[PDB]
Amino acid sequence: GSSGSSGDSIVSAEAVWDHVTMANRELAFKAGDVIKVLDASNKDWWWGQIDDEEGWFPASFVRLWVNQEDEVEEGSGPSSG
Secondary structure, eight states: OOOOOOOOOOEEEESOOOOSSSSSSSOOOOTTOEEEEEEEOOSEEEEEEEEEEEEEEEEEEESSOOOOOOOOOOOOOOOOO
């Protein structure tokens, strides 16, 4: 047969940077695209689901929404005469 379940928690991450891919398989997106995490078996490998697009996206290149961490980095200095 086939059965099974698991905690009901939906995680939503946001592409921090453009993750280009030479292959179609990989779920490509642009900084901003919001992907819906379905399963997170691996430690740094989860399957994402986009409105039309679908595939697996890197967790090391995305920023979680329900994150409990705070980083300090903005960067500045455009130019100076």
